[PDB]
Design a binder for this molecule. Structure first.
Ligand code: GQL
Length: 287
């Protein structure tokens, strides 16, 4: 109840028409809405957006977290492959943090909904991994460390653009552990390289059209598993190249893993060499 107005982002509270709830974050809830005259040069146009806000029983720390999240998004700056901040309503009423709307759910949902028997060419998947790596290297360049990268935290827009989400936060709602690198799992050491590992696992999710890592492997057992040096098996039909890529990401020594800069390169290359007519087969769709 002490928020300052930043005219660079402030949006008249009456220009926001709240609508269907898109769910609820952990530090609040998000609803779909239509923002009037958001272009500012086209004030008579509506723009579908996502508005994060606090619940009625929101603690003082929660608002603290929400404001903190908005300011980080301001710092980080825009980029095609991430969910971008569009405005905020901070005056005369509850705080509304307005960001981009992703009409096609998260990457996982998106993939599974596109399993055979629209579809996804073999290229669609690789270029898909390409965007996530861009968004990730951009954030990495902005000093930002995600700490929880996974298809579920990657949203898809009406134009099939991969946008990374919840990149401006800090602190087991969906069994995250399966995406954590060893040093991050055993010693809470998060870095850009540990985010690379999570990317490996996100590659796996992509070339299984939405599967869950370590299928059936008992969480408790997962621990010693990674220590012994075990890794998941190449996804069905996944190429040899892409499997090597994910193996590098899962390197035992975090310093020896690739970087998002490299990954973005390799993936840029690989996409240019992948057929747009090679539809994959999923006879045994795991998860
Ligand atoms: C950048 O980090 C943020 C900040 C604030 C909200 C979100 C967010 O998640 C969405 C942003 N656009 C969306 N379009 C459709 C569904 C969701 C969504 C909303 C939910 F509440 C849950 C969810 F899983 C997806 C979002 C992401």
């Amino acid at each position: 109840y002490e928020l300052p107005e930043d005219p660079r982002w402030e949006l008249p509270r009456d220009r926001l028409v709240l609508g269907k709830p898109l769910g609820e974050g952990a530090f609040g809830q998000v609803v779909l809405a239509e923002a009037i005259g958001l272009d500012k040069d086209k004030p008579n146009r509506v723009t579908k957006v996502a508005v994060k806000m606090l619940k009625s029983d929101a603690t003082e720390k929660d608002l603290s977290d929400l404001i903190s999240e908005m300011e980080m998004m301001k710092m980080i700056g825009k980029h095609k492959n991430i969910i971008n901040l569009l405005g905020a309503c901070t005056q005369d009423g509850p705080l509304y943090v307005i960001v981009e709307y992703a009409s096609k759910g998260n990457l996982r949902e998106y993939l599974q909904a596109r399993r055979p028997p629209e579809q996804l060419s073999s290229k669609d998947l690789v270029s898909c991994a390409y965007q996530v790596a861009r968004g990730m290297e951009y954030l990495a360049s902005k000093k930002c460390i995600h700490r929880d990268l996974a298809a579920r935290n990657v949203l898809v827009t009406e134009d099939n653009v991969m946008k990374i989400a919840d990149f401006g936060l800090a602190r087991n709602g969906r069994l995250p552990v399966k995406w954590m690198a060893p040093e991050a799992l055993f010693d809470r050491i998060y870095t850009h390289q540990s985010d690379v590992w999570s990317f490996g696992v996100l590659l796996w999710e992509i070339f299984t059209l939405g599967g869950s890592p370590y299928p059936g492997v008992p969480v408790e057992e997962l621990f010693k598993l990674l220590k012994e040096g075990h890794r998941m098996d190449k996804p069905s039909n996944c190429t040899n190249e892409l499997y090597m890529m994910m193996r590098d990401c899962w390197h035992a020594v975090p310093s020896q893993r690739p970087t998002f800069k490299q990954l973005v390169e390799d993936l840029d290359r690989i996409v240019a060499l992948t057929s747009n007519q090679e539809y994959l087969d999923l006879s045994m769709p795991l998860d």
